[PDB]
Amino acid sequence: VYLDRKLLTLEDKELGSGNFGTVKKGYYQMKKVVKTVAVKILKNEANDPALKDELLAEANVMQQLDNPYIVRMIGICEAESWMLVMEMAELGPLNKYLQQNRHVKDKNIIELVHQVSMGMKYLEESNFVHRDLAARNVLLVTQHYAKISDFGLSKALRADENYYKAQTHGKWPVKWYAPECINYYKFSSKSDVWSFGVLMWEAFSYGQKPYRGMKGSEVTAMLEKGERMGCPAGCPREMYDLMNLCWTYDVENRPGFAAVELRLRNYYYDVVNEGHH
Ligand SMILES: Cc1ccc(Nc2cc(N[C@@H]3CCCC[C@@H]3N)nnc2C(N)=O)nc1C
Numbered sequence: 054v055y056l057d058r059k060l061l062t063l064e065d066k067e068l069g070s071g072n073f074g075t076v077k078k079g080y081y082q083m084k085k086v087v088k089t090v091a092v093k094i095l096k097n098e099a100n101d102p103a104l105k106d107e108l109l110a111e112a113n114v115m116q117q118l119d120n121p122y123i124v125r126m127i128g129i130c131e132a133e134s135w136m137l138v139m140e141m142a143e144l145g146p147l148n149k150y151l152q153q154n155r156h157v158k159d160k161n162i163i164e165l166v167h168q169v170s171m172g173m174k175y176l177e178e179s180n181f182v183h184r185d186l187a188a189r190n191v192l193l194v195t196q197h198y199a200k201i202s203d204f205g206l207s208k209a210l211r212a213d214e215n216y217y218k219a220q221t222h223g224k225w226p227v228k229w230y231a232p233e234c235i236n237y238y239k240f241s242s243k244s245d246v247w248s249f250g251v252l253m254w255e256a257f258s259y260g261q262k263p264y265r266g267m268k269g270s271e272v273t274a275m276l277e278k279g280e281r282m283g284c285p286a287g288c289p290r291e292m293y294d295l296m297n298l299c300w301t302y303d304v305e306n307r308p309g310f311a312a313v314e315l316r317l318r319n320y321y322y323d324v325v326n327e328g329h330h
């Protein structure tokens with residue numbers, strides 16, 4: 054899990070940023086080949102060991118995860134600051150990508166979000182909760198290969214319960230969070246299913262923000278009235294129905310990722326069939 058700093062080559066060039074630190078590109082000298090990597094580098098802290106073991110927990114989460122639609126952790130490295138080293142998804146976050154490519158085809162969008170449901174189905178089976186599932190946190194390896202990343206808020210569930218109970222917190226991505234998260238601070242796979250719904254909407258809206266121009270409270274207000282974001286331009290009705298099904302207020306009646314993955318899998322093949330015609 055710990056890596057040799059003298060096998061890692063960083064590039065002065067920065068790729069991204071978040072109030073944990075920054076994202077840069079680099080290379081790790083593997084056994085025979087050199088492998089390209091993305092590295093999370095910490096705001097060299099205080100000494101406020103908050104970020105420090107968020108990174109540690111995040112990395113311990115990721116080393117348990119083995120799946121083609123989850124980003125892979127290469128390892129950690131302590132130097133100037135703390136570094137989390139991951140396999141690189143070159144095309145970057147899904148939302149920025151679709152914002153810069155308004156003419157990706159609908160079928161290609163279905164392909165990518167179904168790939169995300171396969172990763173989440175696996176995550177569900179593994180009794181991990183992601184708690185930050187958004188389009189900014191889906192990364193493109195190619196225009197036809199998506200992976201889930203950014204496991205900073207993630208939790209492994211206890212063997213005796215089906216949800217995780219937040220106690221405190223910093224900012225929450227409220228617009229992606231299910232009502233039971235905001236109301237009872239309970240996070241489960243079903244509430245990841247709710248976020249996946251918002252993720253679908255972002256995707257079919259080519260990277261536009263959900264609940265445009267509203268604050269958390271206006272969002273909570275809308276949803277309690279039973280209101281929901283409408284159908285994005287050009288989004289198939291079957292995919293919009295699945296969105297609304299993900300936004301089932303009542304957790305018990307909201308589907309899990311097995312049902313959601315199967316629904317997407319079938320519809321993608323129906324579309325692949327029609328296209329051949
Ligand atoms: C242009 C570009 C290209 C590749 C990546 N790659 C990654 C980015 C990332 N986290 C950031 C945090 C800030 C918001 C966007 C994103 N969720 N985590 N892991 C990778 C990875 N393993 O590849 N990022 C960018 C910005």
